[PDB]
């Protein structure tokens, strides 16, 4: 059995407190031999190495980042929560003379208040139905916390064939953007006439329904 590093899922903070990221091993304890490293994964594909080597520093790293070894876990004490710290970190150690990584933890920094999400369903045109294909796009914008995806409920019955959800991305104006796709057939478009996009953002149910006769 190899080394399996299990980190956290999602952590929330606020500008004014102190967030501490822990990393628990599986094979044994984390002492001064495991060179603890923390690599920040920025959304623009620009990695930056912050605390690399427990007590070892690095040029360009602010003084608000510090790394300690509380018992047997690598603690990352961050005094503050700025707008440029909301990213994904990793826990790199040393086992079997090689580097061991794992699933990163997405840190969420709740700063600006929430707003109202924009729901807009794009029905397929006539050029796509010629190839016996159909795809509906429901773009979801204006939202800091990406909410769970919802089933494309057609005629009051959710479907499972072709139900995927893309990963949120960091856009401009300190916001995020996402969308959804529903690959269907052209034979079901002429029979059905009820397509909605139910979006649940912290209890707020925003649904924009439409009909077939409303287009043409």
């Amino acid at each position: 059995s190899q080394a399996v590093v299990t980190q956290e899922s999602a952590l929330t903070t606020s500008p004014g407190e102190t967030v501490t990221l822990t990393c628990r091993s599986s094979t044994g304890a984390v002492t001064t031999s495991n060179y603890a490293n923390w690599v920040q994964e920025k959304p623009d594909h620009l990695f930056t190495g912050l605390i690399g080597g427990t007590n070892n520093r690095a040029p360009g790293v602010p003084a608000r980042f510090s790394g300690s070894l509380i018992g047997d876990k690598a603690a990352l004490t961050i005094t503050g929560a700025q707008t440029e710290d909301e990213a994904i970190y990793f826990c790199a150690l040393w086992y079997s003379n090689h580097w061991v990584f794992g699933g990163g933890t997405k840190l969420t920094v709740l700063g600006q208040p929430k707003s109202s999400p924009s729901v807009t369903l794009f029905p397929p045109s006539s050029e796509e139905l010629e190839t016996n294909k159909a795809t509906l796009v429901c773009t979801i914008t204006d939202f800091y916390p990406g909410v769970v995806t919802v089933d494309w409920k057609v005629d009051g019955t959710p479907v499972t064939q072709g139900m995927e959800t893309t990963q949120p991305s960091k856009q401009s104006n300190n916001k995020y953007m996402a969308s959804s796709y529903l690959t269907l057939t052209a034979r079901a478009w002429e029979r059905h006439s009820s397509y909605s996009c139910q979006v649940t953002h912290e209890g707020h149910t925003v649904e924009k329904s439409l009909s077939r006769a409303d287009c043409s």
Binding site: Q2, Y35, N37, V39, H45, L46, F47, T48, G49, G52, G53, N56, R57, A58, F90, A92, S96, N97, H98, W99, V100, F101, G102, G103, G104, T120, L121, F122, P123, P124, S125, E127, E128, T135, V137, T139, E164, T166, Q167, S169, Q171, S172, M177, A178, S179, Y181, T183, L210, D214, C215, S216
Partner: protein, 597 residues
Amino acid sequence: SQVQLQQPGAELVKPGASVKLSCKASGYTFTSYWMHWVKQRPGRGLEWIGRIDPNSGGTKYNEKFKSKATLTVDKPSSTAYMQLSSLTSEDSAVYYCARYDYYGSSYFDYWGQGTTLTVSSESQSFPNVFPLVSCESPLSDKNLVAMGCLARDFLPSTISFTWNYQNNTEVIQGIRTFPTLRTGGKYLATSQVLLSPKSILEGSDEYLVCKIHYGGKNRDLHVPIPAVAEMNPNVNVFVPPRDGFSGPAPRKSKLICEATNFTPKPITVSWLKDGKLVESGFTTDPVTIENKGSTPQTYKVISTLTISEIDWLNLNVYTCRVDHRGLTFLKNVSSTCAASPSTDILTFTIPPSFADIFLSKSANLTCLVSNLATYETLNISWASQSGEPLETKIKIMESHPNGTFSAKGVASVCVEDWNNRKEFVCTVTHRDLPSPQKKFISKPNEVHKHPPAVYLLPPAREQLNLRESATVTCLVKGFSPADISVQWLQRGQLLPQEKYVTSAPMPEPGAPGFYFTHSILTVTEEEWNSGETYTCVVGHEALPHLVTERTVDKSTEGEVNAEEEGFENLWTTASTFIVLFLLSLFYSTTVTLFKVK
């Protein structure tokens, strides 16, 4: 000098082939640091392939990737390659390289920017574009239009989206690019642009173009922009001419329901032949452009229906049904195919008859117009010489067999005005008449007057002998005005005109200017047999009291004498004289015998 790295972008490597990447580093001493390779999947975590020390050496690899490890590191080139052989289906990931300072704090410094590498057995296909326009119509200024071009399939996740207006201008405030999504085959990404109706209706940009820089080949995609409606169509239905029938026999089958005010191109045009919808037999012309350069966007569509001549002369009213945003616009025409060249110039004014004059005590003037080809411009107005306005009754008679029409104007005026020979003017303005026609009606000049002499003749004995029926006739002779009304009464009850006839007045022989007439009251023998009293009344202007009456019945000896003769005294004298004759004769005989003795 800032330390920067150079890594390849999208690389299409077949799985039957090996992938060889690179890691260019500059700005520092390349002969004093190590080199690592971090593998990041799209959905998993970070990995570690292996390391290699360029100066000297002595390194190992991971337990999972012990083979397939290539790290040709060229000291002078200062670039680390990485050859991966035997590519499977789980090698589609992004690799990176950084700098490891072993002789300084053991940490990381700068990193890469991205290396797209998708190992797929398929080949390179052309990405197809699909416009996606929402069906939400802008109701006000707050509602925005959201459109976007969908990219169905593309190997290199690196794809841009450019939106140019009617001209080559790039949108600055519209920078939206959603990441790709692996849906089994190739990828699927889109890009929406949020604009405003204030910058669309005020410009000439009727459609946008979303282009894709896929290897330098840009594809144009005309994305239309929806508009508004609120416009009524101009339905114009034309009729075929009377001489257009192609062919010696009346044959023709062409019409043009023209309707141009239709903003939504899909317009439903149908034909209803006497309520029945026409299934087939009509041609619909394609939608073209009516006017160019103007501000509103108007089109033009003409529907042609092929019919026959026999179905047109049967008074078949067609209807060009036009559907525009649910509104149904109907239009009914007149399938009459008869020319109107018949129109003479001669209008007459008729005084009212004596019967109506006495019945209503209000004369009715007449403005009789004839030979009217058309009646839509007909207007009969009645007035006096002083110009006093008066109401005019307008009624149209049945059309004459030749096709000509007629009309009369009735105006109610007092009889005293007619007695005062008052003048009245009827003004008619017709399209067939070159000029308005002015005419005057008044009482004729002074003429000799003579009241009628009524005479009621009883049926002849010979007529009664056939025991079939009796015709009671009253002769009315010697009246100068021809306006005379003769009626008959039964027990004082009016008799319908279907039971008797009155000959029109005919000039009196031997006396010019005087008129006479008859009236025959044909009565069944059973009715006349009951001693009925039959009378005829004669209403006539010259009469001192305007009406008289004459009587006759079975008596036929209805002389008026009160009581003169027939008394019992006549019988008394007859008897006393018989006695007187007897006594005188006896006395004479006795005288003779006494002469004898």
